[PDB]
Amino acid sequence: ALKAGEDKSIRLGLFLIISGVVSLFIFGFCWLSPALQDLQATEANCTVLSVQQIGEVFECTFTCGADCRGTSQYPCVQVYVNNSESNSRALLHSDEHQLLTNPKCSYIPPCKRENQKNLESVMNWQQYWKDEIGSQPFTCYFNQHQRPDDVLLHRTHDEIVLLHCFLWPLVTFVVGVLIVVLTICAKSLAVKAEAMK
């Protein structure tokens, strides 16, 4: 008989509903502090003031496969910009992770097996910005509410991961309520249609 198994669908429906809801709350509490912080960074217009090296040298780690952990040097380039929203000098970094892994320098090369290639990479980056001094303004990301000294070329997160994370638990909530509605039909309209035989 159908009824002896149909309420398993009810239980599963209910599970998918509450699971969706709880997942939305859990992903809520953990996304909101990063997401807020990463949108609190305004977008502004910028032009480079100057490009230089401070002479200080920093260490990086090169992974030559399978837990290899060698290390190499690189020189510290710094770049500073004019800022359209603060009209004060600020220091250019590529991205939030670059700033975090070295807040002293404007760039970090992809760490190579030999110092000469780190060197060459830093010069190859520097000569590009030596052409972008003044000429052809660019947009820049800027966080005067908490970190007014610096600017970035990119945001911390790609929006797809955020929205993709939020839509699926909502979709499972929708599937849950749909499943319980279909079972309510297959319970009630079934006997209403079958008792006439």
Partner 1 sequence: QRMWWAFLASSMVTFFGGLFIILLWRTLKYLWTVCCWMTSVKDWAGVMISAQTLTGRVLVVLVFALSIGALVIYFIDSSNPIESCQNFYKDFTLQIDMAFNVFFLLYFGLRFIAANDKLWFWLEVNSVVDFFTVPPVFVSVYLNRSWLGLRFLRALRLIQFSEILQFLNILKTSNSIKLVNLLSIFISTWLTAAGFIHLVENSGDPWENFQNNQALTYWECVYLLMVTMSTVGYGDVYAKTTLGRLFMVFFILGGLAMFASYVPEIIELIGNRKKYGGSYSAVSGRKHIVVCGHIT
Ligand X SMILES: CCCCCCCC/C=C\CCCCCCCC(=O)O[C@@H](COC(=O)CCCCCCCCCCCCCCC)COP(=O)([O-])OCC[N+](C)(C)C
Q: In the stretch 164-183, what mask flags binding to partner 1 with x, by CB under 8 A?
A: -x---------x---x--xx
Measured between alpha carbons, how far is 154 from 150 in angstroms, rounded to an integer? 12
Q: Whose Cβ is closer to ligand X: residue 117's or residue 157's?
A: 157
Measured between alpha carbons, how far is 183 from 189 in angstroms, rounded to an integer? 10
Least separation in angstroms between residue 88's CB and its own copies is 14
Interacting positions 52-111 with ligand X (CB under 6 A): none
Q: Whose Cβ is closer to its own copies: residue 68's or residue 167's?
A: 68
Q: Whose Cβ is closer to partner 1: residue 16's or residue 48's?
A: 16
Measured between alpha carbons, how far is 157 from 170 in angstroms, rounded to an integer? 21
Give the one entry of ligand X, partner 1, its own copies, none that residue 12 binds, where binding means its C-beta sits below a cut-off of 5 to 8 angstroms depending on kind. partner 1
Q: Whose Cβ is closer to partner 1: residue 1's or residue 71's?
A: 1
Helix (H, G, I), strand (E, B) or coil at 143: strand
29 contributes a contact to ligand X by CB under 6 A: yes
Q: Which of 39, 165, 182, 186 binds ligand X (CB under 6 A)?
A: 165
Interacting positions 41-80 with partner 1 (CB under 8 A): 66
Q: Where do contacts with its own copies occur on this chain (CB under 8 A)?
A: 37, 64-71, 99-100, 102-104, 113, 146-147, 149-150
Dihedral angle sign, alpha carbons of residues 182, 18, 36, 156: negative
Which of 7-22 are b and which e, b meaning 16 or more Cβ less than 10 Å from the residue's Cβ? Answer: eebeeebeebbeebee
Please state, as a whole number, how many other Cβ atoms lie within 10 Å of the Cβ of residue 162: 15
